[PDB]
Amino acid sequence: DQLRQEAEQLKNQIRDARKACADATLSQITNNIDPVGRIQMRTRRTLRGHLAKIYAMHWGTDSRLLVSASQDGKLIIWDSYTTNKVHAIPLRSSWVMTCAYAPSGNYVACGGLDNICSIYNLKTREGNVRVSRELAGHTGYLSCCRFLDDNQIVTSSGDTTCALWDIETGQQTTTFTGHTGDVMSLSLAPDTRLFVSGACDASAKLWDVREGMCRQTFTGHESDINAICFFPNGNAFATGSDDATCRLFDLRADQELMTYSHDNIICGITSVSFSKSGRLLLAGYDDFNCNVWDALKADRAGVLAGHDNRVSCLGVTDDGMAVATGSWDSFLKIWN
Amino acid sequence: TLSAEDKAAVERSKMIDRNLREDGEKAAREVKLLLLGAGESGKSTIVKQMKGIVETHFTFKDLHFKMFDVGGQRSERKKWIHCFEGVTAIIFCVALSNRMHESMKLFDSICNNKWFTDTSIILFLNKKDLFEEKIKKSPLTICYPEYAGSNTYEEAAAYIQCQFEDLNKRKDTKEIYTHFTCATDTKNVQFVFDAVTDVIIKNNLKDCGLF
C-alpha cells in the first residue's frame, strides 16, 4: 500500500512535531500560582414549574432571562431576578435535549429527537409566540443548537454531521461532515465564526462555519464526549466524557492541556460551562452534583450540593453574576 | 414593595405556573410504552395492526398510550435511551423466522440496563401462520445445535421463549411478559392493556411498602 503508508506516516510525524515542540504541562508553570480556596456557593432562588427531567438551559444575552427544556414538552422563559415565568412555550415533540436563546432576545429555537430544529419568535405583534421556521432535513437526533445571528443557526445531530442553516430561506447552506459517530454537543465561538463539536467516537473537531472546512481534530478520551464549551476568550474549549473526565484542548497547541478527573468520581460528565473570567470550570456530573473546578489547578474548589437527581445542564451569565443548574428533579437553582 | 406593573407580572407568573401544573398533571395521565426491536422485527406490523423518533398516540378503554418508536434512530449508540426512564413498560418485538441470536443479545442488553432495571418488558411474537410452516425444513439447530427436543411448533417455540427469558438476569424486581397468539385476531392490544394494568398496580403497591 502507498496511500495508507503516507497517511500513517503523516499522522505519526505531525504528532512527533507536536511532541518535540511541546515545552511542558501547564501545571509545571502555574504551580506557584496561589489557589482560590473554597467557593462555597449558596442557592439564592429555586425555579419550580417544570414537571419533567430538565435537559438544557441557556442564559440570556442580558444576563437576566433563562430558557429551560424538559421531557414535559415545555420550553419556559424565566426571569432570574424575581423567579417569574415570562413565557411558556408548548412544543410539539417532547423529546427535547437542547435549545438556546438568541443573542438579540428575538428568537428561541428548540427541538430534539424528531430531527427538526424548530425556531420560535417572541417579540411578535400579537403578544404570543409562534414558530418562525422549522429546520428539517436531518436523519438523526439533534443536539446543541446555537444561534449565530437572527438568520444563522448551527446544529449538531446523530447523523455524525453538523449543518449551518439559513433561517430565512430554510435550507442547509453548509454541511460539516467528518465524524464517525453521533455529534451530541457543540458550542459557538465568542466571535461567532468558529465552533467545536464533540462526537460519540471520543473525538472533537474544530469546524469553520464559513467555508465548511474541518480545521482541527481532537482526541484523548476513551468514550463519547458529553459536553463541550468555549473558554470565554475563544481560544480554548473543554470537554466532558462518560469517562468521568473533563478535558481542556487548546485550538492552537492541538493537544489536551489538562484532564479534570478525580478518583472518587464514579460516573461521567453531562454538561460543562465556564465563568466569565474563565477561572471556574463548572461541570454537571451524573451522580447528583455539580463540581466547581479551578481551570488552572484542576482542584474541586467547591461543590454545588442539591439536585437529588443527575445534573444535565449548566450555564453562566454573560456577566458571570450567576450560575443556573438543572437536574432531572425538574428544579433549576441559581447559585451565588 | 411591588411597583404597579410588578403586581401584574406576578399575576401572569401565577397564571403560567397554574397552566404548567395542569399540563404536567395531564402529562402524568398517559402511558409511555417505549418500543424497540431489531431490523424487520415487525415493529411496523405492530404499529399498523394496533389501534427520527416517531410518536403514536392512541387511547384504549379510557386510557391514553404514547408509544415511541426509536427504530428510526440510525445510530445504535444508546445516547437517547436514558431519556425513556419511567416508561410504564417497553415492547420488545421479534419473529421466529442468525437473526435470533442478535435478538437474544439485544434483549439481554435491554434487560441489563441500569435505567430499565425496574421497568418490566413485554415481548410479542404474534405472527403465527408462518412460524410453523417453515419449521418442517429444519429444527432450532440451523445455528442453535443445543436444542434436543422434538421438532414441533409447540415445543420449539416454548424452548425459544424459555431461552429468551433466561436472559433475565434479575427477576426479583423486574418481570417479563410474552405473547404468541396469531397477529390477525385483535388480541394484541388487550395484552398491552393487561400488562400495563398489572405493572401500574405493582408500581402502586410497591410505593406503599405493602409489597
Partner: single-chain antibody, 232 residues
Framework: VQLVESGGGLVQPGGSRKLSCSAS????????MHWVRQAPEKGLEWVAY????????YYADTVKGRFTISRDDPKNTLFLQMTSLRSEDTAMYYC??????????????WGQGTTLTVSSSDIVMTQATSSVPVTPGESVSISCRSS???????????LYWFLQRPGQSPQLLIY???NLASGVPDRFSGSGSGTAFTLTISRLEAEDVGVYYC?????????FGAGTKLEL
C-alpha cells in the same frame, strides 16, 4: 391589530349607556385592557383598568364605584357599562390594550375610540404650555413636571409619551423614559431625572404635529398631563 368600539351616541343625564370594545388581530386573552377618555378639547383622562384574566380591577376616583368593567376572553369583547351619567362624562372614549411582563410596552396600541355625549394624594402632571408654533426641520423639546419622583426602587421611571394627531387616536412614543415604541421612527427621544421629564424631537417633519401628552404609571389612578400642542 384592530381595536374598534361602539355604543356611542347622545344620552340624557341619569341614564345608563354601555360601551363595547371588539378586538381582532391579537391574543386578547393575555392583554390587560384599559379604558381612557378624552373630554372635548381638554385632554386625556384615565377611567378604569382590568388585568389579564379579570384578576385585578381599578377605577379612577372620580367615578370609582359607578362604572363597571366586564371581560369576555372566549369572545374577545371588552365592555364598559356606566350607571349614572352627569354632564362630565361627555368625552371621547378610547380602548387601550396592555401586556405587563419584563420589557413590554403595555400602552402601545390605542383603539379608534367612541365619542359619548351627555346633555346638560393623586399624582399631578403639569404640562408647561398648550400651543407651540414651529416649522419643519427644527428641533423641538417638550416637558412636563411631576408631583412625586416617578423613579421606583426597581430603577424604572414610569412615564409614557404619546401623540394625538388631529382627527386620529393617540399613539405611543416612549413607554418608560427612553424606550422607543413599536414602529415609531427612531427620531423621537426622551430624557429627564426625578421630576423633570422632557421629549426631544429633532429634524421635525409635517406629520409630527398634534396634541402631545405625558401619562404616568407607578400608581392608580393614572393621571394624564394637560397636553402640549405643536402648531405650524
Amino acid at each position: 391589530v384592530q381595536l374598534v368600539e361602539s355604543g356611542g351616541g347622545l344620552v340624557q343625564p341619569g341614564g345608563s349607556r354601555k360601551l363595547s370594545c371588539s378586538a381582532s388581530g391579537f391574543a386578547f386573552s393575555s392583554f390587560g385592557m384599559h379604558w381612557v377618555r378624552q373630554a372635548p378639547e381638554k385632554g386625556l383622562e384615565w377611567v378604569a383598568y382590568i388585568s389579564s384574566g379579570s384578576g385585578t380591577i381599578y377605577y379612577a376616583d372620580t367615578v370609582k364605584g359607578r362604572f363597571t368593567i366586564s371581560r369576555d376572553d372566549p369572545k374577545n369583547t371588552l365592555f364598559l357599562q356606566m350607571t349614572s351619567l352627569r354632564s362630565e362624562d361627555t368625552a371621547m372614549y378610547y380602548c387601550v390594550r396592555s401586556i405587563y411582563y419584563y420589557g413590554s410596552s403595555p400602552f402601545d396600541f390605542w383603539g379608534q375610540g367612541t365619542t359619548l355625549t351627555v346633555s346638560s394624594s393623586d399624582i399631578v402632571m403639569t404640562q408647561a404650555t398648550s400651543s407651540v408654533p414651529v416649522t419643519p426641520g427644527e428641533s423641538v423639546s417638550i416637558s412636563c413636571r411631576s408631583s412625586k419622583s416617578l423613579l421606583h426602587s426597581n430603577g424604572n421611571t414610569y412615564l409614557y409619551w404619546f401623540l394625538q394627531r388631529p382627527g386620529q387616536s393617540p399613539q405611543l412614543l416612549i413607554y418608560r423614559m427612553s424606550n422607543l415604541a413599536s414602529g415609531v421612527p427612531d427620531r423621537f427621544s426622551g430624557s429627564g431625572s426625578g421630576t423633570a421629564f422632557t421629549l426631544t424631537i429633532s429634524r421635525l417633519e409635517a406629520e409630527d404635529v398634534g396634541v402631545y401628552y405625558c401619562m404616568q404609571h407607578l400608581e392608580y389612578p393614572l393621571t394624564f398631563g394637560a397636553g402640549t400642542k405643536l402648531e405650524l
